[PDB]
Amino acid sequence: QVQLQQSGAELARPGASVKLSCKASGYTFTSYGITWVKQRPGQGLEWIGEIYPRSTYTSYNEKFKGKATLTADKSSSTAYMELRSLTSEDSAVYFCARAGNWGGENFFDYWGQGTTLTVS
Amino acid sequence: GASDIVITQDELPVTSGESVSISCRSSKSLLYKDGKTYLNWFLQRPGQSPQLLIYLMSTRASGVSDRFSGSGSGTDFTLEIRRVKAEDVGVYYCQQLVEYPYTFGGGTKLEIK
Ligand SMILES: C=CC[N+]1([C@H]2C[C@H]3[C@@H]4CC[C@H]5C[C@H](O)[C@@H](N6CCOCC6)C[C@]5(C)[C@H]4CC[C@]3(C)[C@H]2OC(C)=O)CCCC1
Numbered sequence A: 001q002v003q004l005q006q007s008g009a010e011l012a013r014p015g016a017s018v019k020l021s022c023k024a025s026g027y028t029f030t031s032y033g034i035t036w037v038k039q040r041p042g043q044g045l046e047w048i049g050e051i052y053p054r055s056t057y058t059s060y061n062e063k064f065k066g067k068a069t070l071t072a073d074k075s076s077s078t079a080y081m082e083l084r085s086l087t088s089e090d091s092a093v094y095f096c097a098r099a100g101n102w103g104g105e106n107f108f109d110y111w112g113q114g115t116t117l118t119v120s
Numbered sequence B: 001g002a003s004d005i006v007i008t009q010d011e012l013p014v015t016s017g018e019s020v021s022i023s024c025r026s027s028k029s030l031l032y033k034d035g036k037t038y039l040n041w042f043l044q045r046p047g048q049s050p051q052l053l054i055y056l057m058s059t060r061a062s063g064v065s066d067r068f069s070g071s072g073s074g075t076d077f078t079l080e081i082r083r084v085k086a087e088d089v090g091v092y093y094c095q096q097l098v099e100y101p102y103t104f105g106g107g108t109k110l111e112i113k
Helices: none
Strands: A003-006 A009-013 A018-025 A034-037 A045-051 A058-060 A069-074 A078-083 A092-099 A115-119 B007-009 B022-028 B039-044 B051-055 B068-072 B075-079 B088-098 B106-112
Touching: A003 A092, A003 B039, A009 A018, A009 A058, A018 A034, A018 A092, A018 A115, A034 A069, A034 A078, A045 A069, A058 A069, A078 A092, B007 B088, B022 B088, B022 B106, B039 B068, B051 B068, B075 B088
Parallel strands: A009 A115
Antiparallel strands: A003 A018, A018 A078, A034 A045, A034 A092, A045 A058, A069 A078, A092 A115, B007 B022, B022 B075, B039 B051, B039 B088, B068 B075, B088 B106
């Protein structure tokens, strides 16, 4: 059973940073990637970026470059997203999801439950 | 981003057991040189994570009811929802994966009468 388990909701102050985690289990973590999505309260979905721990490959939406930093720890099958210089626009639910390989399988097939960030 | 692919969705309360179709248009073709069309449909139920319904334009994801079907041309797409149920309530999104950045439509809400 594939599972992605996200860290708990957080309250943060403007100007602070936070580091959100996404723990993967039930499959070979390094055979796939992890991708992150933002949803502001009441709003749509936005793609942040992806990371592939085996090759270290990353891709970012330019909108989030230097707001979001994606890392991964192969030794614990955990992906991280650090959000810096927080503002009220950063209040959202952040999801992680699996990212797949060439051929288009396993893209956004499993999701974490989301982490709510509230910037005060 | 000025050059990002823009995805537009149509708007729809649906009577239980009736049917709706949701449409999605892309500003560029999502048909890649490999012959596949990189268009996803998601349902995000309230308080839940988005669920992949359809990928590669027309392939139903594992676990998804055959009440959902996807079709399209490469620039225009449709999600058919048969025999609508309470569990179908939420926001439907289409998403393209043909080019970076990946982009989503603005969502289509479905509410049950
Ligand atoms: C069909 C085209 C659409 N794009 C391609 C782009 C493709 C990626 C290019 C970069 C690769 C680096 C990475 O190191 C690779 N390794 C990970 C470890 O295992 C072996 C492979 C896979 C990798 C992430 C590719 C996976 C499939 C990628 C996302 C493709 O997208 C899809 C949805 O299939 C083009 C631009 C936007 C996405």
